[PDB]
Every structure is written in structure tokens, then in C-alpha cells.
Design a binder for this molecule. Structure first.
Ligand SMILES: Nc1nc2c(ncn2[C@@H]2O[C@H](COP(=O)(O)OP(=O)(O)NP(=O)(O)O)[C@@H](O)[C@H]2O)c(=O)[nH]1
Ligand SMILES: [Mg+2]
Length: 176
């Protein structure tokens, strides 16, 4: 019965272990799933959101982060309008991988894809390995909006997905 005015394909991308699957599950179900294991292929969720009285259906591909699946994950960029690019604030390696993820999206996605950078596991701040300020500098240098999120608590998860959609809606309306 429920309709929508817009349909967008999104990805969730980033190194294994960063919390991609937990982020999608939090956005859709509003709970932390704590038995989550490695995605061995691709998972899907969808949700309709209300953006200013416009209903936007998000079709979201939660991709495998393990290196062994990289050629598979790369096949998903085509047709994606938006992506959440995720690292783990407690794992510097996952943050150091970000340049490679952005190189992939530059080569394989639409030049107009909207990417939101998510520093996840913010609830694990006592084990932080990446500063807010330093990630903020990187995002700015890369023309990306940046949020710290927690799949566990929900902090900024709805905001990340909604803002990706709002930025795509803005492109549709005006400019580039
Ligand atoms: N404390 C905390 N743990 C989290 C958070 N998000 C994910 N985790 C935990 O981190 C681990 C990896 O999460 P998961 O969502 O499976 O990661 P993934 O990015 O989907 N991995 P893959 O790419 O291999 O599928 C799990 O043990 C999960 O419970 C978070 O915000 N806070
Ligand atoms: Mg996963």
C-alpha cells in the first residue's frame, strides 16, 4: 500500500569488521544485532523515509568488506546513487584503507554518486585510534560529509542515511 516518490540505490562499503551490516540493521530495525558475522556475498535492506514530505525508498546493498570479495563488491558501484563509506574508529587500518575505497568509487561509480563518511563504533571511544579532528580534515580534503556513528546505540545512523538521500535530492533539483 505504501508508496514513494523516489527510488535510490545505496551501498554500504568499507573494510571488513567495520560494522556495515550492523549499521543497516540499526537503520531498518532500530536495534543492535550482537551475533553479526562476516557478510559472505551481499545483503539487502530497504526503507521508505520522509524527506520534506517527499517519500524516498532506499534500496540498500550491504557489501562484503573482506578482500577476497573485492571484485564482487566492485560490481555494485554501477547504478548506485549513494554510498555510506564506513571505517571503525578503533582500527586505524580501516581508516587507512579509505583512500583505496574512494579510488574504487572514482573509477567505477557515477561521478555524481554521493558518499557519506561514517566513523563507526563511537560507543567504543575508550579504544579510539582515529581522532574526530583528523578524520574531519580527511573528509574535508576529499569533499565528503563526515559523521561518527554507533550501530550499537543508534547515534547518527538515521542521520547518515537521510543526509545521503537529501544530498541526492538536492542534486536532482539544482546544479551540477
Ligand atoms: N561496540 C560496537 N560494536 C559494533 C558496532 N558495529 C558493529 N560492531 C561489531 O563489530 C563486528 C563487525 O560488525 P559487522 O556489522 O558484522 O561488520 P561488517 O562491516 O558488516 N563486516 P563484513 O564486511 O565482513 O561483512 C561485530 O562483532 C559487531 O557486533 C558499533 O557501533 N559498536
Ligand atoms: Mg557485513
Amino acid at each position: 500500500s505504501e508508496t514513494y516518490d523516489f527510488l535510490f540505490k545505496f551501498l554500504v562499503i568499507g573494510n571488513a569488521g567495520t560494522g556495515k551490516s550492523c549499521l543497516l540493521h540499526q537503520f531498518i530495525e532500530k536495534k543492535f544485532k550482537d551475533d553479526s558475522n562476516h557478510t559472505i556475498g551481499v545483503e539487502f535492506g530497504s526503507k521508505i523515509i520522509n524527506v520534506g514530505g517527499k517519500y524516498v525508498k532506499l534500496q540498500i546493498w550491504d557489501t562484503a568488506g573482506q578482500e577476497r570479495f573485492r571484485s564482487v563488491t566492485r560490481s555494485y558501484y554501477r547504478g548506485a546513487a549513494g554510498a555510506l563509506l564506513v571505517y571503525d574508529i578503533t582500527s586505524r587500518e580501516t581508516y587507512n584503507a579509505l583512500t583505496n575505497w574512494l579510488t574504487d568509487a572514482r573509477m567505477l561509480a557515477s561521478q555524481n554518486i554521493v558518499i557519506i563518511l561514517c566513523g563507526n563504533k563511537k560507543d567504543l571511544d575508550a579504544d579510539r585510534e582515529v581522532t574526530f579532528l583528523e578524520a574531519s580534515r580527511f573528509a574535508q580534503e576529499n569533499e565528503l560529509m563526515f559523521l561518527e556513528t554507533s550501530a550499537l546505540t543508534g547515534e547518527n545512523v538515521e542521520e547518515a542515511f537521510v543526509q545521503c538521500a537529501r544530498k541526492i535530492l538536492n542534486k536532482i533539483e539544482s546544479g551540477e
